[PDB]
Design a protein around this ligand. Structure first.
Ligand code: LAQ
Ligand code: MG
Length: 329
């Protein structure tokens, strides 16, 4: 076996490590535990819709990153109070429940008789009620990996707010997340910091696999240790990967503009993250049909993105309309 810990807090490089080990490491008789922490990041599953899963506006104005991982499943929040664990094995040795049991041992080592259980859907629940860990996994040609979270000191009130989407009128068959009551380990026992739990998990893994209790710190940007890793990190951070992989969806919504008032109806089909069909319908007593048709036509093929939409009475109405549209992206 082998225990690695990333020195980086950049989700995209840390995910690239997963890709890399998956692609390049011989895991036969040598499983790998990989420990990592990210800066503030919402991580959606492979087949998810981020407009459906999080408050993107609040994320942008707080500097919270969005990443899409290669495994399926739901949406979680990562910050420095959260530990990520990746158990790499051969496909034959893929065993999610074995890994979760190992984590339970580790937690009990630093807090004897901690009430943490693993459920059938691979969550870890604290005191039979509160989610402290969620699981996903990926199978490849040469390897399997199981990764999970571990909430030690994560901003729980901030977590809940970032994962509450304000986007209305979305019709999609993208993968849904499963909301849960969560808790931190440090809420139960203030000694269970990330550092303490990381060490506890490494120690347990070392004993379980009969290897030296040594964490090898690794640099996920090092092309000499990990040839080709920076191209993986680039791909993972492309708009095409993060947003463009979103399953087909439609938006059917409206908003009101002061004038009394005027209601504008918005019908937008979004495919591959790009505006495939666009019909913004303003009352022709407020804005000429040709002007709305201009706006609809210019949006076609454009990215469903609040950036790629910015670029006397009518000009003022246009701006109000553009800003409302920006606000749903
Ligand atoms: N960090 C973290 N840990 C545990 N639970 C969380 C977290 N963030 C949010 N949640 C709660 O879980 C649900 C989502 O649960 P759901 O079951 O829908 O999704 C998951 O658990 C997926 C886990 C993915 C783990 C990967 C590991 C390396 S990269 S991300 C969310 O609505 C909140 O209630
Ligand atoms: Mg789970």
């Amino acid at each position: 076996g082998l225990i690695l810990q990333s020195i980086s807090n950049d989700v995209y490089h840390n995910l690239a490590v997963e890709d890399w080990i998956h692609d390049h490491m011989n895991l036969e008789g040598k499983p790998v535990l990989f420990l990592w922490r990210n800066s503030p990041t919402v991580v959606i599953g492979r087949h998810q819709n981020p407009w459906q899963e999080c408050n993107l506006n609040l994320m942008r104005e707080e500097g919270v990153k969005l990443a899409r991982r290669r495994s399926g499943g739901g949406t979680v929040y990562h910050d420095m109070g959260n530990i990520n664990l990746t158990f790499f094995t051969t496909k034959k040795k893929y065993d999610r429940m074995e890994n979760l049991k190992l984590v339970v041992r580790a937690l009990k080592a630093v807090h004897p008789h901690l009430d943490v259980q693993a459920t059938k859907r691979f969550d870890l629940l604290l005191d039979g009620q509160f989610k402290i860990s969620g699981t996903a996994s990926k199978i490849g040609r040469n390897a399997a990996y199981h990764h999970c979270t571990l909430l030690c000191g994560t901003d729980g009130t901030f977590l809940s707010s970032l994962l509450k989407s304000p986007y209305q009128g979305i019709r999609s068959n993208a993968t849904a997340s499963t909301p849960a009551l969560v808790k931190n380990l440090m809420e139960k026992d203030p000694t269970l910091t990330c550092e303490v739990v990381i060490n506890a998990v490494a120690t347990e893994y070392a004993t379980s696999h009969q290897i030296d209790n040594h964490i090898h710190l690794i640099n996920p940007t090092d092309e000499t240790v990990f040839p080709g890793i920076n191209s993986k990190a680039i791909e993972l951070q492309t708009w095409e990967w993060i947003y463009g992989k979103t399953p087909k969806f439609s938006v059917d919504t409206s908003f009101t503009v002061l004038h009394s008032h005027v209601e504008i109806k918005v019908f937008i089909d979004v495919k591959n993250g790009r505006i495939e069909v666009c019909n913004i319908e303003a009352p022709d007593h407020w804005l000429p049909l040709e002007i709305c048709d201009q706006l609809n036509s210019s949006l076609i093929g454009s990215k469903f993105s609040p950036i790629e939409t910015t670029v006397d009475e009518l000009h003022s109405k246009w701006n109000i309309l553009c800003e409302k549209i920006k606000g749903i992206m």
